[PDB]
Amino acid sequence: MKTVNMKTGTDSFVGEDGKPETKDQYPWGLRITLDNESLQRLGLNAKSLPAVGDSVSVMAMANVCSVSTRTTDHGEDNYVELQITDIGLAPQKRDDAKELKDAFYPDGEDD
């Protein structure tokens, strides 16, 4: 749960930009209260870190942050204040793997 937005595969591929994908999170609003989501599982190699961003449909401002280590299964949490467009995730970087999945908001818990 659910479509709107995003899905795997993203998929960062070998070791790429992570801009993916398209359609859609829309650029006008403001938000400070509720939840988000991000996680996955099957990986292979090395260091990762995602991000967010926004402005007017393209470029190029703002972030929050996040960083992960080598495992197969993870997840952190939310944002706070945003302009409004919210591109991202913007993962990176080095080594390869492939098939490394993701999939980006919202709802969803564990335990």
């Binding site: 749960m1 996955q40 709802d107 969803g108 818990e109």
Partner: protein
């Protein structure tokens, strides 16, 4: 062979399930090939509109002795919520309103679709309810499996046995028993299945597109959503094993048998009082395996004349049910 992957009811099918020399209904009826399952459980609405919150309690220390004056510090008690989500499933059904009347009596037709589709549905629900997820959600169950402790709270769940291999797929399943009253949740609107109803509008055709649309038909669907509830964990009791080969050595012998069942039984009760009953699950094969292995342990056992034992359906004498669990979880107890 240019393209197209087709569905929907076609005259082909309705001509397969029909009869010659009449008949009215379909030769009562259509039988067979698919497993059948229990659970057969209880539902629950209520709270919040998602998740399920709940609480349990975290620690309860501590009192200290008084020396007729020395009293000093107060103490408190704390807790922490947990919860998880649910999920829903439903496709839909179609007929060609005309063909439903050719020959007449469509109610029996849609009844066949009803019982069959119901069978496949609940089959799916039993298949995925007992194995959790790293996927597009509902729900979670095996997540309580990995062994030892301190990395999680197994123990009373992971009594279990070891062996098999972790690098090759074979074969070793598992047996489960957990009490009810620890419900399964549904979002606040009607419950699983409930269908039922009907709608009769127009297509909406196949692929490209097909060349138009517009035609009246019968259409409807069965929806269903679920999500298990931990509520309180201690009712669950799980076992890893075997893989059937170690249970071949105990065919009647008593080295590595299944009597660790007893252990699992005595690993639950506090209480934790409730909720009314319990039940233990098998995968078929392991059921009968347990029977044949049990009738001949080197120990107690009387059995006048003759064997092979009044079914089993006991021990002790909590009824056992049979499930459609996979026959290969590899080891996956500790990687």
């Amino acid at each position: 062979m240019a393209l197209i992957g087709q569905t929907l009811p076609s005259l082909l099918d309705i001509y397969n399930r029909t009869d010659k020399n009449g008949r009215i209904a379909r030769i009562v009826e259509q039988l067979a090939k698919t497993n059948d399952i229990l659970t057969d459980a209880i539902y629950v609405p209520c709270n919040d509109g998602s998740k399920h919150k709940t609480t349990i309690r975290a620690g309860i220390p501590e009192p200290v002795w008084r020396r007729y004056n020395q009293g000093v510090q107060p103490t408190k008690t704390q807790t922490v919520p947990v919860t998880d989500t649910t999920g829903m499933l439903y496709d839909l059904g179609f007929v060609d309103k005309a063909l439903a009347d050719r020959s007449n009596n469509a109610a029996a037709f849609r009844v066949s679709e009803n019982m069959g589709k119901l069978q496949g549905f609940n089959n799916k629900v039993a298949r995925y309810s007992i194995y959790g997820n790293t996927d597009a959600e509902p729900e979670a169950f095996m997540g309580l499996a990995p062994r030892f402790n301190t990395l999680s709270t197994s123990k009373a769940a992971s009594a279990e046995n070891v062996f098999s291999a972790g690098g090759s797929g074979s074969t070793n399943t598992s047996i489960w028993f957990m009490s009810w009253g620890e419900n399964t949740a549904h979002m606040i609107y009607p419950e699983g299945m409930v269908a039922g109803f009907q709608h009769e509008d127009l297509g909406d055709d196949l692929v490209s597109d097909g060349n138009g649309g517009q035609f009246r038909a019968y259409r409807d669907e069965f929806k269903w959503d679920i999500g298990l509830s931990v509520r309180d964990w201690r009712s669950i009791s799980r076992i890893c094993n075997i893989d059937v080969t170690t249970l071949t050595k105990d065919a009647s012998t008593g080295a590595d048998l299944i009597s660790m069942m007893v252990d699992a039984y005595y690993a639950r009760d506090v209480a934790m009082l409730g909720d009314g009953k319990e039940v233990i699950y098998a995968n078929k094969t392991i059921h009968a395996w347990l029977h044949k292995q049990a009738m001949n342990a080197k120990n107690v056992n009387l059995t006048i004349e003759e064997y092979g034992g009044k079914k089993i359906v006991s021990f002790l004498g909590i009824p056992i049910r049979r499930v459609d669990a996979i026959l290969n979880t590899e080891s996956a107890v500790t990687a």
